[PDB]
Structure 1
Amino acid sequence: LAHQLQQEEDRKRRSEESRQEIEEFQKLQRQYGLDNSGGYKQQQLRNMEIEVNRGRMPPSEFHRRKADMMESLALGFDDGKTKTSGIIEALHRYYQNAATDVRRVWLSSVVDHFHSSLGDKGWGCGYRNFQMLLSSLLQNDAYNDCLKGMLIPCIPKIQSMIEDAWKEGFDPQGASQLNNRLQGTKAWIGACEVYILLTSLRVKCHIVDFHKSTGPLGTHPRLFEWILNYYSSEGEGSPKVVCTSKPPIYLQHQGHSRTVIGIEEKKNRTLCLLILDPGCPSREMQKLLKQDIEASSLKQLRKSMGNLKHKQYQILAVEGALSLEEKLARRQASQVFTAEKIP
């Protein structure tokens, strides 16, 4: 009797615990894109079917878009429908010609913005950031040999390319964290995946891990100072606006990533990062294209230390090209995967 009383309560507790665990696991696997419920192709189609069902899109047009999607996916090429070009050149014009609170501003080289489409909304950030970074490398002659013949890949192709890096032997522990597969999924990725992808293409790059806050009020001054150092040059005759040859910086925090395309040193000596978000729709990006930039729009691009209070950031920065021997050295190093840590 006594034993039965204990056994029954335990059973009931266990069952409730199990139900809770199962429900949570499901929610998390789904959020992280690891529940094996399908990929980009599926989401695009499902979301376009909503657009038909809601009466917002003709059924014929669904067939045309689907056709075009399938061609792009077969080729492995992004279709460009979420791309906005000319932001660097527009910022250069603005900073040169407009009365600002800026002493000096450093910009990365030409960079195309990519936002998520219907296919990757909610999960494509890391991939879209990779596309922005790559757009800059593809216009930079330093990377012509390593990246020869490449166009911006579509998200499914990026997933394939990561898998290829895993197959070569990069970062097996990272592969195992994502079930060794990315195609046909909505998997969140991080700087570690972007790293092995670029390394596998013979691009020299590295991660820096800002693993805890370094300033008052949970700020990350070290991060701002690292980016200033990356963008800036020692001195001499540097102009107020410097459009550098440097690629932009991939910026990860838990849950989301963005692309840093420059940094402003205000007249009061504080620093402000210029950040593109792959969540920003084309109509918002277009505002930066008009000759006089709204105050809200500029404010949206500008991030001060108060705006970066996540516990941990990682950056990935690109530094040049690798020899095959240097790539193989990095492939072996990636077996015990580490990054520079600050502090």
Structure 2
Amino acid sequence: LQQEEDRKRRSEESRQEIEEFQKLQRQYGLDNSGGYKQQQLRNMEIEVNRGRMPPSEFHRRKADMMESLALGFDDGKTKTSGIIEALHRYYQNAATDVRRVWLSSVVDHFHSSLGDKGWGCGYRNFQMLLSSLLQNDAYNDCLKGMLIPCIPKIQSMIEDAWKEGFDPQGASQLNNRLQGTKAWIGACEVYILLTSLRVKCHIVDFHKSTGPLGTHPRLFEWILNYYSSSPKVVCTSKPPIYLQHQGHSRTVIGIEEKKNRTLCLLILDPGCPSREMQKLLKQDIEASSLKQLRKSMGNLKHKQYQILAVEGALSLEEKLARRQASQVFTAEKIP
């Protein structure tokens, strides 16, 4: 009799497991249900079906999209330039509560398109970081004037790193395939991607909070030490910092030392639409517009953050040493 009862129980556990598995696979982009190309087209088709887009332009945006995918180049439609320069002007000229502020070099903001909205953050943060390297002469040899790659090309380039031998454990976690998927990525993928391009970088794993009320003072202090080294506003040469938490990533482009001695990060978000970033390019920024960029310790209460920071270029020998090191993938842990 209990055999039947056991069957009923297992049959319900199975329906529950199957349902949650499919949900999680979809969320993380691992259910192998297509990729950027399909989502762009499906989401443009919705705009046509909602009478918000003529079929002719659809044919045109689809044509553009296909050229970009063929070339592997991001088409720049989600790019906003000039933010570092605008911030420089603001901190220099405007009355602020800042004692000193350190900024990364020039950084282009990239937000998701209809093709990667919901899952592209890691890739878009890579684009923002790469845009800084591409204007930094120290990376000219290892990046030889490459262009910002499109998301499918970034996926191909991560696969290329896996094929070279980088991080086989991480590769297996993502079915050894990213093209044609909407897979979430993390600092580990960005690390092997940059390392495969002979860019010297490293991950720091802030694996638990270090301050009261769940704050991460060690993270803020690490970033302060990264950016700092006389003027009130210091526009440094340094690339921005890739910042990962569970479910989403962002790009840290600077840090303020407030007059009250507290620290405040300046963070770009690939979820921010163009029209919001454009507000920062208006003559005389509105201090209320800067609040979205400013994150104090109270705003960073995820349990775990990983940063990926870039430090220069690698010789081939150094790259190969790092490839081998990536077989047992570890990162500096703090605390």
TM-score w.r.t. the length of structure 2 is 1.00
**Match for residue 35 of structure 1?**
31
Q: Is the CA contact 2:205–2:307 (under 8 Å) kept in the aligned structure 1?
A: yes
SS in 2 for 1:19: helix
Q: CA deviation at 1:279?
A: 0.1
Number of equivalenced pairs: 335
CA distance in 2 between partners of 1:91 and 1:35 (Å):
41
Checking the alignment, whether the CA contact within 8 Å between 1:45 and 1:119 is kept in structure 2 is yes
Distance in 2 of aligned mates of 1:199 and 1:287: 35
2:269 to 277, 290, 299: 277
State how far apart, in whole Å, the 1-side matches of 2:314 and 2:202 are. 12
1:260 and 2:260 correspond: no
Structure 1 Cα separation of the partners of residues 293 and 318 of structure 2: 36
Shift of 1:292: 2.0
Secondary structure in structure 2 of the residue aligned to 1:252: strand
Q: CA deviation at 1:291?
A: 1.9
Matches of 2:288 and 2:176, distance apart in 1: 43
1-structure distance, mates of 2:84, 2:271: 18
Give distance in 2, aligned partners of 1:306 and 1:67.
45
Asked if structure 2 preserves the Cα contact closer than 8 Å seen for 1:78 and 1:152, the reply is yes
Q: What displacement does 1:149 show? A: 3.2
Q: Which runs of 5+ in 2 are unaligned?
A: none
Superposed displacement of residue 293, structure 1:
1.8
* CA deviation map 1:146-202 (0-9, x unaligned): 000300000000000000000000000000000000000000000000000000000
**d(CA) in 2 for partners of 1:313, 1:179:** 24
- Checking the alignment, whether the CA contact within 8 Å between 1:264 and 1:271 is kept in structure 2 is yes
**CA-to-aligned-CA distance 1:232-289 (integer Å, 9 cap, x gap):** 00xxxx1000000000000000000000000000000000000000000000000000
Q: Give the C-alpha shift of residue 294 in structure 1.
A: 2.1
Secondary structure of the residue aligned to 1:146 is helix
| 1:74-93 equivalent positions in 2, closer than 5 A | 74-93=70-89
2: distance between equivalents of 1:313 and 1:10? 43
Question: Is 2:333 the partner of 1:337?
Answer: no
Fraction of identical pairs, as percent: 100
The answer (yes or no) to whether the contact 1:94–1:291 under 8 Å persists in 2 is no
8 A Cα contact 1:207 1:315, kept in partner: yes
Q: What is the rounded CA distance, in whole Å, between the counterparts of 2:214 and 2:284 in structure 1? A: 34
- For residues 110 and 294 of structure 1, the distance between their equivalents in structure 2, rounded to whole angstroms, comes to 21
Runs of 4+ in structure 1 displaced over 3 angstroms?
none
Residue 202 of structure 2 aligns to a residue whose secondary structure is strand
Q: Secondary structure at the match of 1:225?
A: helix
CA RMSD of aligned residues (A): 0.4
Q: How many Å separate the matches in 2 of 1:13 and 1:280?
A: 46
The DSSP-based 3-state class of the residue aligned with 2:145 is coil
What TM-score comes out, normalization by structure 1 length? Answer: 0.97
Mean CA deviation greater in 294-303 or 138-147: 294-303
Q: Is the counterpart of residue 55 in structure 1 residue 55 in structure 2? A: no
Q: Is the 8 A contact 2:133 2:139 kept in 1?
A: yes
| 8 Å Cα contact 2:134/2:145 also seen in 1 | no
